[PDB]
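@channel anyone free to eyeball this complex?
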Amino acid sequence: EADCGLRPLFEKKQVQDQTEKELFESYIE
Amino acid sequence: IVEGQDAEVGLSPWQVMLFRKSPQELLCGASLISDRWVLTAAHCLLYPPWDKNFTVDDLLVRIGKVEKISMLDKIYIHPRYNWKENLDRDIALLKLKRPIELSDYIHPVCLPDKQTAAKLLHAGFKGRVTGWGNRREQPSVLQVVNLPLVERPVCKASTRIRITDNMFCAGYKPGEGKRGDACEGDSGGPFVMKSPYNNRWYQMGIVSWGEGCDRDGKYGFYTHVFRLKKWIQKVID
Ligand code: NA
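replying in thread with the prediction:
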């Protein structure tokens, strides 16, 4: 799927969900 | 989902509900991986002790809540799925009668590639679990919880079940502060992680099994999607 992973209501709108920061934060220790 | 919270609208467009046809009840979560294919846990379809051997006309999917209900055409369970011992290779593919129409509420998730592993499957790294399963041991809206991947030895030591490389576990350790787990009704749903590489969501796991729901010193065990990618690609060819 060429368009997989990108949410119509989020990644297509550059809007980030309420608990996204939580995830990426864990990546840096 | 125990100790989760109400999801935002359209947070998981790949969310699929597996319903019993009669009497209708949520049996399992599942995921949308293309416009035609659905991914879920094997034990959601086949578990002989509980007398369970679902055919295509025993079940109906639910996608988007805008909601498109569908019937399946063919079920594919892993040939070396082991229900006797540890639920090894707990994976199954659902083929929808016909392609589904994509929308703001219906959109497929990505399957991880070798690079996406290397980069994301690490201890401490958080992933997302979502479902309409029980809140304790019924939700009004889809539930979301974020749980960190747990070291392999810690998983092995938390249970007596034999753990295979075809599984991984996630959750918080006793007194880490945060809690959370999947529960009855979330089984077969997605464990998804977001890639910093391409801003896309990837499904790393399938909610498989656990001893109870959100217990201290215990963890939910998830089917290792990437490690079973070959088989997923094989049945589609
Ligand atoms: Na736990």
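from a first look: Chain A is about 30% helix and 0% strand.
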